[PDB]
mmCIF file of C-alpha atoms in Angstrom:
data_model
loop_
_atom_site.group_PDB
_atom_site.id
_atom_site.type_symbol
_atom_site.label_atom_id
_atom_site.label_comp_id
_atom_site.label_asym_id
_atom_site.label_seq_id
_atom_site.Cartn_x
_atom_site.Cartn_y
_atom_site.Cartn_z
ATOM 1 C CA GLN K 1 -5.662 17.556 -14.485
ATOM 2 C CA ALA K 2 -2.133 18.686 -15.022
ATOM 3 C CA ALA K 3 -0.917 18.613 -18.578
ATOM 4 C CA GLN K 4 2.286 16.902 -17.587
ATOM 5 C CA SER K 5 1.771 13.350 -16.237
ATOM 6 C CA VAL K 6 4.016 12.236 -13.360
ATOM 7 C CA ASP K 7 3.216 8.641 -14.297
ATOM 8 C CA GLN K 8 4.312 9.129 -18.029
ATOM 9 C CA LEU K 9 7.490 10.899 -16.801
ATOM 10 C CA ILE K 10 8.480 8.281 -14.201
ATOM 11 C CA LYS K 11 7.878 5.513 -16.868
ATOM 12 C CA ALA K 12 10.313 7.402 -19.073
ATOM 13 C CA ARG K 13 12.909 7.195 -16.197
ATOM 14 C CA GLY K 14 12.397 3.475 -16.168
ATOM 15 C CA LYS K 15 9.942 2.933 -13.247
ATOM 16 C CA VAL K 16 6.655 1.120 -13.441
ATOM 17 C CA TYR K 17 4.135 3.622 -12.081
ATOM 18 C CA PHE K 18 3.207 6.783 -10.265
ATOM 19 C CA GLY K 19 -0.276 6.174 -8.675
ATOM 20 C CA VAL K 20 -2.796 7.246 -6.069
ATOM 21 C CA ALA K 21 -5.325 5.938 -3.597
ATOM 22 C CA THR K 22 -8.984 6.212 -4.601
ATOM 23 C CA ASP K 23 -12.333 4.489 -4.469
ATOM 24 C CA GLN K 24 -15.920 4.769 -5.889
ATOM 25 C CA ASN K 25 -16.824 7.813 -3.651
ATOM 26 C CA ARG K 26 -13.916 9.760 -5.089
ATOM 27 C CA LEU K 27 -14.254 8.569 -8.674
ATOM 28 C CA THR K 28 -17.980 9.860 -8.882
ATOM 29 C CA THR K 29 -17.167 13.243 -7.526
ATOM 30 C CA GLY K 30 -15.143 16.291 -8.334
ATOM 31 C CA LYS K 31 -12.282 16.036 -10.728
ATOM 32 C CA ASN K 32 -10.753 12.956 -9.254
ATOM 33 C CA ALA K 33 -11.347 10.662 -12.147
ATOM 34 C CA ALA K 34 -10.145 13.117 -14.688
ATOM 35 C CA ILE K 35 -6.896 13.646 -12.761
ATOM 36 C CA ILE K 36 -6.361 9.982 -12.345
ATOM 37 C CA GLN K 37 -6.909 9.264 -15.972
ATOM 38 C CA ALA K 38 -4.548 12.035 -17.104
ATOM 39 C CA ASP K 39 -1.702 12.029 -14.459
ATOM 40 C CA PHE K 40 -1.488 8.688 -12.671
ATOM 41 C CA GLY K 41 -0.945 5.035 -13.836
ATOM 42 C CA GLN K 42 -2.000 3.032 -10.748
ATOM 43 C CA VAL K 43 -4.705 2.936 -8.164
ATOM 44 C CA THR K 44 -4.958 1.532 -4.645
ATOM 45 C CA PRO K 45 -8.453 1.140 -3.038
ATOM 46 C CA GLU K 46 -8.569 3.396 0.032
ATOM 47 C CA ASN K 47 -11.082 1.301 1.846
ATOM 48 C CA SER K 48 -13.094 -1.064 -0.446
ATOM 49 C CA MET K 49 -10.836 -4.085 -0.155
ATOM 50 C CA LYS K 50 -10.284 -4.024 3.631
ATOM 51 C CA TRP K 51 -11.726 -6.836 5.811
ATOM 52 C CA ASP K 52 -14.670 -4.808 7.229
ATOM 53 C CA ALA K 53 -15.879 -3.884 3.723
ATOM 54 C CA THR K 54 -15.392 -7.282 2.049
ATOM 55 C CA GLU K 55 -16.342 -9.811 4.801
ATOM 56 C CA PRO K 56 -18.535 -8.135 7.396
ATOM 57 C CA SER K 57 -20.017 -11.437 8.427
ATOM 58 C CA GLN K 58 -18.006 -14.685 8.076
ATOM 59 C CA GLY K 59 -18.484 -16.155 4.555
ATOM 60 C CA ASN K 60 -20.811 -13.384 3.496
ATOM 61 C CA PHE K 61 -18.635 -11.407 1.088
ATOM 62 C CA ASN K 62 -19.470 -7.993 -0.339
ATOM 63 C CA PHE K 63 -17.472 -6.943 -3.461
ATOM 64 C CA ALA K 64 -19.598 -4.063 -4.720
ATOM 65 C CA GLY K 65 -17.024 -1.369 -4.043
ATOM 66 C CA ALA K 66 -14.033 -3.415 -4.909
ATOM 67 C CA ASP K 67 -15.624 -4.489 -8.197
ATOM 68 C CA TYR K 68 -16.308 -0.880 -9.047
ATOM 69 C CA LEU K 69 -12.663 0.147 -8.592
ATOM 70 C CA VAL K 70 -11.265 -2.951 -10.512
ATOM 71 C CA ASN K 71 -13.659 -2.464 -13.379
ATOM 72 C CA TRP K 72 -12.824 1.275 -13.503
ATOM 73 C CA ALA K 73 -9.099 0.640 -13.491
ATOM 74 C CA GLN K 74 -9.212 -1.942 -16.099
ATOM 75 C CA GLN K 75 -11.366 0.252 -18.445
ATOM 76 C CA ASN K 76 -8.844 3.121 -17.940
ATOM 77 C CA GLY K 77 -5.650 1.224 -18.222
ATOM 78 C CA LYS K 78 -4.524 1.590 -14.645
ATOM 79 C CA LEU K 79 -2.548 -0.928 -12.555
ATOM 80 C CA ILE K 80 -4.034 -1.968 -9.241
ATOM 81 C CA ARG K 81 -2.475 -2.607 -5.927
ATOM 82 C CA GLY K 82 -4.796 -4.586 -3.546
ATOM 83 C CA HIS K 83 -4.931 -3.314 -0.068
ATOM 84 C CA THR K 84 -5.064 -5.044 2.456
ATOM 85 C CA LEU K 85 -5.644 -8.642 3.459
ATOM 86 C CA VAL K 86 -4.364 -9.068 6.990
ATOM 87 C CA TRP K 87 -4.480 -6.002 9.215
ATOM 88 C CA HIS K 88 -5.534 -5.547 12.871
ATOM 89 C CA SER K 89 -7.440 -2.261 12.162
ATOM 90 C CA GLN K 90 -10.781 -2.121 10.363
ATOM 91 C CA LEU K 91 -11.277 -5.745 11.445
ATOM 92 C CA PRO K 92 -14.780 -7.051 12.079
ATOM 93 C CA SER K 93 -15.730 -8.105 15.558
ATOM 94 C CA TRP K 94 -16.538 -11.641 14.480
ATOM 95 C CA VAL K 95 -12.819 -12.178 13.718
ATOM 96 C CA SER K 96 -11.345 -10.717 16.803
ATOM 97 C CA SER K 97 -13.767 -12.849 18.906
ATOM 98 C CA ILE K 98 -12.073 -16.139 17.703
ATOM 99 C CA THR K 99 -9.733 -17.651 20.180
ATOM 100 C CA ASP K 100 -9.120 -21.014 18.429
ATOM 101 C CA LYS K 101 -5.897 -21.257 16.352
ATOM 102 C CA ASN K 102 -7.325 -23.705 13.823
ATOM 103 C CA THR K 103 -10.485 -21.689 13.322
ATOM 104 C CA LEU K 104 -8.597 -18.303 12.857
ATOM 105 C CA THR K 105 -6.061 -19.932 10.556
ATOM 106 C CA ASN K 106 -8.823 -21.283 8.341
ATOM 107 C CA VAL K 107 -10.725 -17.909 8.395
ATOM 108 C CA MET K 108 -7.581 -16.082 7.536
ATOM 109 C CA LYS K 109 -6.819 -18.346 4.640
ATOM 110 C CA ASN K 110 -10.212 -18.210 3.266
ATOM 111 C CA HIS K 111 -10.380 -14.435 3.366
ATOM 112 C CA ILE K 112 -7.122 -14.296 1.546
ATOM 113 C CA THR K 113 -8.072 -16.922 -0.992
ATOM 114 C CA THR K 114 -11.478 -15.572 -1.735
ATOM 115 C CA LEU K 115 -10.358 -11.978 -2.375
ATOM 116 C CA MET K 116 -7.311 -12.873 -4.421
ATOM 117 C CA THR K 117 -9.162 -15.502 -6.577
ATOM 118 C CA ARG K 118 -11.965 -13.135 -7.463
ATOM 119 C CA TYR K 119 -9.433 -10.756 -9.029
ATOM 120 C CA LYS K 120 -6.914 -13.431 -10.244
ATOM 121 C CA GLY K 121 -4.610 -11.953 -12.779
ATOM 122 C CA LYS K 122 -5.860 -8.397 -12.494
ATOM 123 C CA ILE K 123 -3.872 -7.141 -9.458
ATOM 124 C CA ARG K 124 -0.148 -6.225 -9.892
ATOM 125 C CA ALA K 125 0.652 -6.361 -6.167
ATOM 126 C CA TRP K 126 -1.106 -7.107 -2.885
ATOM 127 C CA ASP K 127 -0.403 -5.651 0.638
ATOM 128 C CA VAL K 128 -0.751 -9.086 2.187
ATOM 129 C CA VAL K 129 0.247 -8.152 5.797
ATOM 130 C CA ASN K 130 -0.041 -4.538 6.969
ATOM 131 C CA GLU K 131 1.477 -2.839 10.054
ATOM 132 C CA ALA K 132 2.840 -6.023 11.621
ATOM 133 C CA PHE K 133 5.693 -4.228 13.523
ATOM 134 C CA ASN K 134 5.910 -2.295 16.707
ATOM 135 C CA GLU K 135 8.181 0.846 16.747
ATOM 136 C CA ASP K 136 10.897 -1.085 18.582
ATOM 137 C CA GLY K 137 11.058 -3.662 15.887
ATOM 138 C CA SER K 138 9.214 -6.389 17.768
ATOM 139 C CA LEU K 139 6.034 -7.896 16.204
ATOM 140 C CA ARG K 140 2.765 -6.152 17.027
ATOM 141 C CA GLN K 141 0.627 -8.203 19.288
ATOM 142 C CA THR K 142 -2.583 -8.434 17.233
ATOM 143 C CA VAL K 143 -5.225 -11.067 17.387
ATOM 144 C CA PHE K 144 -3.352 -12.910 14.553
ATOM 145 C CA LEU K 145 -0.173 -12.990 16.504
ATOM 146 C CA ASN K 146 -1.752 -13.857 19.774
ATOM 147 C CA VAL K 147 -3.938 -16.699 18.500
ATOM 148 C CA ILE K 148 -1.942 -18.160 15.610
ATOM 149 C CA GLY K 149 1.576 -17.077 16.631
ATOM 150 C CA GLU K 150 4.517 -15.732 14.533
ATOM 151 C CA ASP K 151 3.638 -18.258 11.811
ATOM 152 C CA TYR K 152 0.727 -16.198 10.709
ATOM 153 C CA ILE K 153 3.031 -14.150 8.508
ATOM 154 C CA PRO K 154 4.410 -17.137 6.687
ATOM 155 C CA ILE K 155 0.982 -18.685 6.450
ATOM 156 C CA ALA K 156 -0.575 -15.521 4.982
ATOM 157 C CA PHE K 157 2.192 -15.164 2.268
ATOM 158 C CA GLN K 158 2.148 -18.939 1.294
ATOM 159 C CA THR K 159 -1.643 -18.829 1.015
ATOM 160 C CA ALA K 160 -1.492 -15.625 -1.052
ATOM 161 C CA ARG K 161 1.031 -17.070 -3.477
ATOM 162 C CA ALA K 162 -1.187 -20.153 -4.125
ATOM 163 C CA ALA K 163 -4.282 -17.969 -4.697
ATOM 164 C CA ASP K 164 -2.767 -15.787 -7.347
ATOM 165 C CA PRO K 165 0.877 -16.537 -8.434
ATOM 166 C CA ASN K 166 0.753 -13.505 -10.763
ATOM 167 C CA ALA K 167 0.668 -10.992 -7.967
ATOM 168 C CA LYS K 168 3.667 -9.432 -6.159
ATOM 169 C CA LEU K 169 3.209 -9.954 -2.464
ATOM 170 C CA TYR K 170 4.121 -7.133 -0.142
ATOM 171 C CA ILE K 171 4.559 -6.585 3.583
ATOM 172 C CA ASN K 172 3.684 -2.973 4.265
ATOM 173 C CA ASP K 173 4.411 -0.643 7.177
ATOM 174 C CA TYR K 174 4.971 2.968 8.273
ATOM 175 C CA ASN K 175 7.875 4.721 9.993
ATOM 176 C CA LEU K 176 10.380 3.151 7.791
ATOM 177 C CA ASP K 177 11.662 6.541 6.886
ATOM 178 C CA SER K 178 14.969 6.671 8.704
ATOM 179 C CA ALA K 179 17.901 4.332 8.410
ATOM 180 C CA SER K 180 18.761 4.595 12.107
ATOM 181 C CA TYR K 181 15.276 3.890 13.425
ATOM 182 C CA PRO K 182 14.857 0.418 14.985
ATOM 183 C CA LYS K 183 11.676 -0.432 13.047
ATOM 184 C CA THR K 184 13.480 0.031 9.680
ATOM 185 C CA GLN K 185 16.338 -2.263 10.654
ATOM 186 C CA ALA K 186 13.962 -4.850 12.122
ATOM 187 C CA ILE K 187 11.745 -5.299 9.062
ATOM 188 C CA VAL K 188 15.016 -5.733 6.896
ATOM 189 C CA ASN K 189 16.280 -8.440 9.238
ATOM 190 C CA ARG K 190 12.951 -10.297 9.563
ATOM 191 C CA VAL K 191 12.267 -10.190 5.735
ATOM 192 C CA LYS K 192 15.703 -11.482 5.122
ATOM 193 C CA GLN K 193 15.066 -14.391 7.621
ATOM 194 C CA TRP K 194 11.633 -15.163 6.187
ATOM 195 C CA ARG K 195 12.776 -15.294 2.674
ATOM 196 C CA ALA K 196 15.675 -17.574 3.661
ATOM 197 C CA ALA K 197 13.044 -19.882 5.017
ATOM 198 C CA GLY K 198 11.180 -19.796 1.618
ATOM 199 C CA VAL K 199 8.440 -17.395 2.483
ATOM 200 C CA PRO K 200 7.245 -15.643 -0.677
ATOM 201 C CA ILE K 201 7.734 -11.988 0.119
ATOM 202 C CA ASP K 202 8.169 -10.148 -3.142
ATOM 203 C CA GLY K 203 8.206 -6.578 -1.763
ATOM 204 C CA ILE K 204 8.553 -4.235 1.130
ATOM 205 C CA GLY K 205 6.089 -1.338 0.983
ATOM 206 C CA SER K 206 7.053 1.772 2.924
ATOM 207 C CA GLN K 207 3.981 3.939 3.514
ATOM 208 C CA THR K 208 6.003 7.145 3.834
ATOM 209 C CA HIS K 209 3.617 9.296 5.914
ATOM 210 C CA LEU K 210 5.986 12.128 6.481
ATOM 211 C CA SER K 211 6.249 15.227 8.573
ATOM 212 C CA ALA K 212 7.974 18.350 7.224
ATOM 213 C CA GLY K 213 11.629 17.926 6.567
ATOM 214 C CA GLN K 214 11.603 14.138 6.819
ATOM 215 C CA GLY K 215 12.096 13.523 3.086
ATOM 216 C CA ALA K 216 15.872 13.798 3.380
ATOM 217 C CA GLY K 217 16.059 10.717 5.540
ATOM 218 C CA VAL K 218 14.283 8.571 2.946
ATOM 219 C CA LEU K 219 17.445 8.944 0.708
ATOM 220 C CA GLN K 220 19.228 6.628 3.157
ATOM 221 C CA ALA K 221 16.292 4.492 4.407
ATOM 222 C CA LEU K 222 15.018 3.311 1.127
ATOM 223 C CA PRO K 223 18.372 1.712 0.090
ATOM 224 C CA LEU K 224 18.430 0.103 3.523
ATOM 225 C CA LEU K 225 14.992 -1.420 2.896
ATOM 226 C CA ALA K 226 16.255 -2.550 -0.510
ATOM 227 C CA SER K 227 19.110 -4.373 1.135
ATOM 228 C CA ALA K 228 16.711 -7.056 2.439
ATOM 229 C CA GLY K 229 16.892 -8.567 -1.105
ATOM 230 C CA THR K 230 13.257 -8.445 -2.049
ATOM 231 C CA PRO K 231 12.747 -8.168 -5.829
ATOM 232 C CA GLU K 232 10.827 -4.859 -5.217
ATOM 233 C CA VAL K 233 10.306 -2.137 -2.856
ATOM 234 C CA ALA K 234 7.749 0.594 -3.271
ATOM 235 C CA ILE K 235 6.505 3.792 -1.598
ATOM 236 C CA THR K 236 2.883 2.931 -0.976
ATOM 237 C CA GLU K 237 0.993 5.661 0.896
ATOM 238 C CA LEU K 238 2.989 8.951 0.414
ATOM 239 C CA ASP K 239 1.891 12.162 1.872
ATOM 240 C CA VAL K 240 3.859 14.972 3.467
ATOM 241 C CA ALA K 241 2.692 17.557 6.067
ATOM 242 C CA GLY K 242 3.009 20.920 4.464
ATOM 243 C CA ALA K 243 3.574 19.292 1.052
ATOM 244 C CA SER K 244 6.993 21.019 0.588
ATOM 245 C CA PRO K 245 8.575 20.465 -2.809
ATOM 246 C CA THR K 246 11.807 19.713 -1.007
ATOM 247 C CA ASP K 247 10.322 16.709 0.789
ATOM 248 C CA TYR K 248 8.405 15.462 -2.265
ATOM 249 C CA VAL K 249 11.375 15.670 -4.590
ATOM 250 C CA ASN K 250 13.661 13.781 -2.013
ATOM 251 C CA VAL K 251 11.225 10.913 -1.764
ATOM 252 C CA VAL K 252 11.009 10.655 -5.707
ATOM 253 C CA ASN K 253 14.826 10.820 -5.913
ATOM 254 C CA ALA K 254 15.176 8.069 -3.319
ATOM 255 C CA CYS K 255 13.024 5.805 -5.563
ATOM 256 C CA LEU K 256 15.040 6.801 -8.623
ATOM 257 C CA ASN K 257 18.200 5.935 -6.828
ATOM 258 C CA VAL K 258 17.103 2.548 -5.772
ATOM 259 C CA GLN K 259 16.974 0.010 -8.670
ATOM 260 C CA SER K 260 14.247 -2.203 -7.012
ATOM 261 C CA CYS K 261 11.900 0.691 -6.352
ATOM 262 C CA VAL K 262 9.090 0.058 -8.781
ATOM 263 C CA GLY K 263 6.923 3.151 -8.034
ATOM 264 C CA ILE K 264 5.175 5.513 -5.817
ATOM 265 C CA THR K 265 1.642 5.753 -4.686
ATOM 266 C CA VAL K 266 0.415 9.048 -3.081
ATOM 267 C CA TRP K 267 -2.409 8.628 -0.597
ATOM 268 C CA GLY K 268 -5.202 10.681 -2.317
ATOM 269 C CA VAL K 269 -5.667 13.308 -4.904
ATOM 270 C CA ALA K 270 -6.844 16.592 -3.282
ATOM 271 C CA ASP K 271 -5.952 17.965 0.008
ATOM 272 C CA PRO K 272 -9.468 18.139 1.595
ATOM 273 C CA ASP K 273 -9.883 14.437 1.025
ATOM 274 C CA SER K 274 -6.770 13.403 2.718
ATOM 275 C CA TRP K 275 -6.854 11.368 5.935
ATOM 276 C CA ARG K 276 -4.550 14.200 7.300
ATOM 277 C CA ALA K 277 -6.341 17.096 5.602
ATOM 278 C CA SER K 278 -5.355 19.615 8.266
ATOM 279 C CA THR K 279 -1.753 19.366 7.136
ATOM 280 C CA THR K 280 -2.559 19.980 3.382
ATOM 281 C CA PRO K 281 -0.190 17.090 2.493
ATOM 282 C CA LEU K 282 -1.147 16.131 -1.132
ATOM 283 C CA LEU K 283 -0.187 17.248 -4.607
ATOM 284 C CA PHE K 284 -3.528 18.931 -5.601
ATOM 285 C CA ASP K 285 -5.310 21.628 -3.656
ATOM 286 C CA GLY K 286 -8.995 21.980 -2.764
ATOM 287 C CA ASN K 287 -9.758 23.347 -6.171
ATOM 288 C CA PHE K 288 -8.058 20.342 -7.893
ATOM 289 C CA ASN K 289 -5.188 22.436 -9.077
ATOM 290 C CA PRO K 290 -1.614 21.109 -9.046
ATOM 291 C CA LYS K 291 0.473 22.435 -6.193
ATOM 292 C CA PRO K 292 4.134 23.562 -6.283
ATOM 293 C CA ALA K 293 5.185 20.118 -5.256
ATOM 294 C CA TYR K 294 3.490 18.471 -8.239
ATOM 295 C CA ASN K 295 5.383 20.887 -10.642
ATOM 296 C CA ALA K 296 8.645 20.302 -8.827
ATOM 297 C CA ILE K 297 8.313 16.540 -9.287
ATOM 298 C CA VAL K 298 7.602 17.032 -13.044
ATOM 299 C CA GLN K 299 10.649 19.249 -13.301
ATOM 300 C CA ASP K 300 12.800 16.711 -11.499
ATOM 301 C CA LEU K 301 11.627 13.828 -13.667
ATOM 302 C CA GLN K 302 11.992 15.538 -16.949
#
């Protein structure tokens, strides 16, 4: 652990949290738990709340891993973001085999409702729909879009709101990191239109999986995302190839500059455990020591 907590410091600047992705396998090994306890204020399950983990056969739910994380978070005073309800990846074969609209609608609704009700009142925010857009701004042709149609997004959000009205409901995506990129503009336009139609979208989550030097563009992209008029935006899965302080400080400053940006989640603790480990993109190294980018964030926030 670092002696200076980025979560305490971002709270002192008026934000809600600075958090990290984790799960039982991380919490029981190394120094991950100690670092999260000391330095972070929020956790996102890396895998334990995805559809493959939680409903591997229809109506036969498995909550062991998810329960572990929620109970640990509650004992340790950390906020939770639930991740993720509707996504085309990590999706069991029994779901993608369904071709009937009524059947898939009911399965989707039941999956949403069951997960959200189990943890009712304990989850600050849910990524309800993940990675719904193509790069050109059209909607990604997934089993949900093909079988249910465009209405799957409204249905998912309305169902989620009913299941737990305490939670903030997010749409989450990647490559929303440049203001001039078509995906960025498209999600703004579609969210504006959905909310005008009464769909309960409380937040846009921007994953922010960056390459070196891309932090600068977030300074203009995040205000653009905020212009959709959602109550919140958040940086949800931050990592940066090369972990340059310059890129990390720019992303933090982008959130500081945007009033509706509630917080930042970094996508893991230590470099070797990153889903992109070959690019050493996190804030702690393989010996669990804070990297220059961690200290630069601390200095920026103080």
